[PDB]
Design a protein around this motif. Structure first.
Motif, PDB file in Angstrom:
ATOM      1  N   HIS A   1      18.634  27.154  53.482  1.00 40.03           N
ATOM      2  CA  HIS A   1      19.250  28.483  53.332  1.00 40.03           C
ATOM      3  C   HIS A   1      20.472  28.439  52.428  1.00 40.03           C
ATOM      4  O   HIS A   1      20.961  29.476  52.007  1.00 40.03           O
ATOM      5  CB  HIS A   1      19.740  29.027  54.671  1.00 40.03           C
TER       6      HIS A   1
ATOM      7  N   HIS B   1      23.377  27.321  53.445  1.00 38.91           N
ATOM      8  CA  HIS B   1      24.565  27.591  54.257  1.00 38.91           C
ATOM      9  C   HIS B   1      24.568  26.999  55.688  1.00 38.91           C
ATOM     10  O   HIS B   1      23.524  26.569  56.205  1.00 38.91           O
ATOM     11  CB  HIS B   1      24.806  29.110  54.304  1.00 38.91           C
TER      12      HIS B   1
ATOM     13  N   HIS C   1      24.866  26.864  59.847  1.00 43.44           N
ATOM     14  CA  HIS C   1      24.357  27.609  60.968  1.00 43.44           C
ATOM     15  C   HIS C   1      25.146  27.266  62.205  1.00 43.44           C
ATOM     16  O   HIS C   1      25.634  26.146  62.340  1.00 43.44           O
ATOM     17  CB  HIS C   1      22.892  27.286  61.167  1.00 43.44           C
TER      18      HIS C   1
ATOM     19  N   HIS D   1      15.231  31.325  61.819  1.00 47.06           N
ATOM     20  CA  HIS D   1      15.255  32.638  61.160  1.00 47.06           C
ATOM     21  C   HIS D   1      15.068  32.546  59.619  1.00 47.06           C
ATOM     22  O   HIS D   1      15.060  31.452  59.061  1.00 47.06           O
ATOM     23  CB  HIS D   1      16.608  33.262  61.444  1.00 47.06           C
TER      24      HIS D   1
ATOM     25  N   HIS E   1      16.097  34.628  55.607  1.00 47.98           N
ATOM     26  CA  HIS E   1      16.936  35.605  54.933  1.00 47.98           C
ATOM     27  C   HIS E   1      16.161  36.431  53.911  1.00 47.98           C
ATOM     28  O   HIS E   1      14.937  36.474  53.871  1.00 47.98           O
ATOM     29  CB  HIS E   1      18.185  34.930  54.362  1.00 47.98           C
TER      30      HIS E   1
HETATM   31 NI    NI Z   1      20.544  31.117  57.732  1.00 48.76          NI
END
Ligand code: NI
Length: 157
Positions: A145, A147, A149, A155, A157
């Motif tokens: 992602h 980034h 968590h 999940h 994006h």
């Molecule tokens: Ni994420």
């Protein structure tokens, strides 16, 4: 371990601009993927868990130039019809693709409104007090992602 490419780093910080305190708190971020301003990542680079330091990040490594071409004339009707549009008023908009687009009204002449599109910290030097609280390696999901968590909640994006 040390801060570097693809670590998730937790910091506690105080951000001060021109001797005044603007923000303070704690965050975790994935290092080496443009999640923070480049100069703050540069000051963090190579640091061990536990370090506490001051970093003066100059404008060219923070929010960049206050670009004179970011000051443009736009029509009054571009604003909501009940908005208070007067010299000095601040607005927080979202630019076409979705990003923040804070703006400042600098002049108003009939239907012509002179607006400053620059980021509020444009041309400011930033002073941080930082503590490196935690350094760890990233999960595959975090790497995917771009980034950090907080937990185990799968999940997209
Ligand atoms: Ni994420």
């Amino acid at each position: 371990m040390k801060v570097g490419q693809d670590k998730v780093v937790t910091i506690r910080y105080t951000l001060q601009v021109e001797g005044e305190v603007l923000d303070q708190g704690e965050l975790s971020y994935l290092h080496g993927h443009r999640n923070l301003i480049p100069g703050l990542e540069e000051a963090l680079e190579g640091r061990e868990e536990g370090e506490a330091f001051q970093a003066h990040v100059p404008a060219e490594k923070a929010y960049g130039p206050h670009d004179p071409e970011g000051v443009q004339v736009v029509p009054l009707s571009a604003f909501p019809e009940d908005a208070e549009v007067v010299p000095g008023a601040q607005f927080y908009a979202q630019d076409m693709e979705g990003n923040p687009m804070p703006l400042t009204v600098v002049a108003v002449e009939g239907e012509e409104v002179t607006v400053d599109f620059n980021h509020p910290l444009a041309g400011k030097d930033l002073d941080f007090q930082v503590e490196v609280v935690k350094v760890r390696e990233a999960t595959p999901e975090e790497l995917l992602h771009g980034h950090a968590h907080p937990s185990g909640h799968h999940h997209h994006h």
